[PDB]
Amino acid sequence: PSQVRQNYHQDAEAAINRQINLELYASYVYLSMSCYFDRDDVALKNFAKYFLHQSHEEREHAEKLMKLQNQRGGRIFLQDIKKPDRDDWESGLNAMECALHLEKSVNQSLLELHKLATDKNDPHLCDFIETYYLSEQVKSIKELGDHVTNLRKMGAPEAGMAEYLFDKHTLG
Amino acid sequence: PSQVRQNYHQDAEAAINRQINLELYASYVYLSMSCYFDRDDVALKNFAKYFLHQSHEEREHAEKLMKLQNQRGGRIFLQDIKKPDRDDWESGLNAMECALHLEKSVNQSLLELHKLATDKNDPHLCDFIETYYLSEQVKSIKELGDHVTNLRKMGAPEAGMAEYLFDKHTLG
Amino acid sequence: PSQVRQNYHQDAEAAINRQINLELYASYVYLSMSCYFDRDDVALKNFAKYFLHQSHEEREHAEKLMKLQNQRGGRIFLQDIKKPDRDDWESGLNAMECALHLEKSVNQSLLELHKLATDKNDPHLCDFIETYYLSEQVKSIKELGDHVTNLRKMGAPEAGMAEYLFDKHTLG
Amino acid sequence: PSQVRQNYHQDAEAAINRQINLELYASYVYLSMSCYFDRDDVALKNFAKYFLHQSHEEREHAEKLMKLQNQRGGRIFLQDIKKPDRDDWESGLNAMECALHLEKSVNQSLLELHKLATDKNDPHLCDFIETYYLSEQVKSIKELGDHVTNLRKMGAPEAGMAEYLFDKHTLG
Ligand SMILES: [Fe+3]
Numbered sequence: 108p109s110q111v112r113q114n115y116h117q118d119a120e121a122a123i124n125r126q127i128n129l130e131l132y133a134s135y136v137y138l139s140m141s142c143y144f145d146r147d148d149v150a151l152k153n154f155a156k157y158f159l160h161q162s163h164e165e166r167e168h169a170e171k172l173m174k175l176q177n178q179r180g181g182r183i184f185l186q187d188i189k190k191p192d193r194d195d196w197e198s199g200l201n202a203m204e205c206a207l208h209l210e211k212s213v214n215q216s217l218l219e220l221h222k223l224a225t226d227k228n229d230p231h232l233c234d235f236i237e238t239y240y241l242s243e244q245v246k247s248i249k250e251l252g253d254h255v256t257n258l259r260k261m262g263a264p265e266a267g268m269a270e271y272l273f274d275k276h277t278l279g
Numbered sequence: 280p281s282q283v284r285q286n287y288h289q290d291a292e293a294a295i296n297r298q299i300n301l302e303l304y305a306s307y308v309y310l311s312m313s314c315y316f317d318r319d320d321v322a323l324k325n326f327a328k329y330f331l332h333q334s335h336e337e338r339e340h341a342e343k344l345m346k347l348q349n350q351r352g353g354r355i356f357l358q359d360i361k362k363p364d365r366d367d368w369e370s371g372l373n374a375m376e377c378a379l380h381l382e383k384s385v386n387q388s389l390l391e392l393h394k395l396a397t398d399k400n401d402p403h404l405c406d407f408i409e410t411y412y413l414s415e416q417v418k419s420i421k422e423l424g425d426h427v428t429n430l431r432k433m434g435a436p437e438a439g440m441a442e443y444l445f446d447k448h449t450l451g
Numbered sequence: 452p453s454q455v456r457q458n459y460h461q462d463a464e465a466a467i468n469r470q471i472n473l474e475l476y477a478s479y480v481y482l483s484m485s486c487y488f489d490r491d492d493v494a495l496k497n498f499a500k501y502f503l504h505q506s507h508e509e510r511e512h513a514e515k516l517m518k519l520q521n522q523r524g525g526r527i528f529l530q531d532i533k534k535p536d537r538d539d540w541e542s543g544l545n546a547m548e549c550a551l552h553l554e555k556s557v558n559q560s561l562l563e564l565h566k567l568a569t570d571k572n573d574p575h576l577c578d579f580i581e582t583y584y585l586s587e588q589v590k591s592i593k594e595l596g597d598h599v600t601n602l603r604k605m606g607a608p609e610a611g612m613a614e615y616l617f618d619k620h621t622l623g
Numbered sequence: 624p625s626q627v628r629q630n631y632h633q634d635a636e637a638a639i640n641r642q643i644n645l646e647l648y649a650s651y652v653y654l655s656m657s658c659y660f661d662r663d664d665v666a667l668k669n670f671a672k673y674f675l676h677q678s679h680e681e682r683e684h685a686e687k688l689m690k691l692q693n694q695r696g697g698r699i700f701l702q703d704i705k706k707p708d709r710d711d712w713e714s715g716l717n718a719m720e721c722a723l724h725l726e727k728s729v730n731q732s733l734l735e736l737h738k739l740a741t742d743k744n745d746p747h748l749c750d751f752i753e754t755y756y757l758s759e760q761v762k763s764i765k766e767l768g769d770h771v772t773n774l775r776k777m778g779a780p781e782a783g784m785a786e787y788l789f790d791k792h793t794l795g
Pocket residue numbers: 616788
């Protein structure tokens with residue numbers, strides 16, 4: 108094997124590659140949302156900025172996983188990055204709800220990866236996931252839930268002023 | 280002819296003079312809008328500021344065309360600057376819609392001018408129009424479309440708060 | 452159509468979407484190269500840094516195309532980002548050769564897109580491609596050719612010192 | 624027992640003392656390497672500097688373990704620090720290979736210590752080992768593997784220029 112490989116199960120390496128592809132897919136979905144809100148018939152600049160920042164953060168998460176895989180002596184295997192489920196995200200509120208669902212799915216995959224690391228007795232991988240991924244997932248889920256709650260209370264998307272003022276005040 | 284004239288067709292010179300008059304007319308229309316929003320019974324300061332800035336930008340575009348005409352050895356012929364079609368612009372949303380229409384008409388005239396430059400094999404004129412006028416027209420049209428979309432979603436002009444809050448948050 | 456759409460053919464919109472997917476694919480390929488050179492059994496840090504920078508530049512090119520598509524009133528349609536052709540790039544020289552091939556293919560697609568813009572009489576699109584994409588492609592192709600020539604003269608990859616010293620002196 | 628002792632098994636205390644002695648031994652071995660490369664007939668200053676820094680880092684690791692042992696109410700028991708296996712390390716490449724082996728052995732002992740902490744339900748000890756020792760071991764192993772790979776590709780130690788240029792460019 109690799110000269111640096113030590114206590115790194117092949118199942119963990121495969122699951123790291125799968126998580127890499129999932130993070131890249133999440134980056135792609137956020138890019139799709141960000142480009143939806145830049146349309147002339149949507150025109151919510153701070154929503155688009157927020158989702159572009161989320162896309163870049165997901166890219167950084169994938170790159171950190173790739174660095175971890177090379178650090179442990181595993182070999183990175185890249186797969187296709189699937190296109191997002193839709194191109195029209197229909198509202199700021201619907202995009203925030205879908206982002207919340209996506210982040211919860213990514214968190215569930217990370218929890219499965221941590222369970223795999225625990226079952227294989229890989230404390231370094233468990234420490235990596237706990238330190239760099241689980242807490243960030245919890246904060247992201249809480250922030251998206253806060254956003255969805257506020258937009259819902261404002262009357263979005265029926266109340267046309269709601270998404271505009273949320274764009275100005277919360278995301279601006 | 281002029282001692283500096285070279286590869287400058289008379290049709291291009293005439294079309295440059297026509298474009299000069301069109302830019303001056305657009306400046307006049309924007310000045311009319313800006314003075315409409317400064318009325319005591321309208322009182323939207325940031326709308327008036329936005330349209331005054333647009334008027335000054337259109338005048339700068341006309342001056343740049345005049346400089347181009349003198350640079351190529353053509354002779355500037357000024358015509359009457361027609362008064363705008365109306366004095367009462369009736370709302371912020373209606374003024375933005377009419378501005379979008381005016382910018383699209385100016386862009387169509389610029390595209391015709393570029394086609395004329397291409398048919399006459401004047402690469403300097405084509406480069407001038409592409410570099411300094413077409414891209415700015417595209418950005419201006421996109422910005423006006425964004426403004427119209429946002430005002431429409433806010434419920435303007437029926438929702439009285441819409442134009443006020445758009446004046447404060449987007450134009451302010 | 453879009454309220455901002457003007458002189459934007461549907462063929463141009465489709466070709467812009469295809470170019471978007473091509474730029475994203477090129478970013479993915481460069482990311483694959485960058486992760487190959489971070490392996491413990493390759494260990495060329497400046498090669499990996501160079502290819503990571505190339506990946507980020509390709510993503511920026513894709514984002515600029517997306518902004519152009521929204522600016523002209525076209526609608527962005529995202530497709531799958533295909534996985535790179537290989538995971539093992541076998542040497543610094545082979546990776547540079549494949550990068551040169553990839554950049555030439557991207558340039559050929561850009562030239563086809565410019566020919567389409569010229570045939571449809573879209574001077575704004577032609578100006579966009581010429582200003583922001585063709586010159587950068589020419590610089591990138593020249594730089595990659597220089598790199599390949601230097602590595603070949605050094606005796607890479609048979610001469611083991613060649614890629615190391617190229618990593619230190621040229622890429623470092 | 625100690626007035627501060629709480630949830631600290633005697634097996635954990637014994638294993639902490641053993642790890643202390645192992646870290647001190649690793650510091651001694653690195654000091655031996657550093658003094659080997661300062662010889663007039665070897666004369667690789669940056670190799671010696673690198674190994675002296677490694678020796679000081681291992682001593683700091685031992686001191687941190689000693690502080691942990693006093694913090695939990697355990698009692699430090701020091702043993703003999705055995706002399707290194709050899710005095711002549713024969714090359715930069717051989718010294719790097721032996722350093723890689725030594726760091727992997729230290730990492731294996733740390734993994735055993737973490738398994739002991741997990742079996743005894745000592746979350747503070749597991750957190751201490753994961754935060755301060757396992758990640759650093761992974762970085763050190765990866766760095767040493769990178770060094771060995773680069774020296775091997777350069778042709779060390781047969782190619783006399785290889786260790787000199789690695790000393791100047793990588794370690795300098
Ligand atoms: Fe040198």
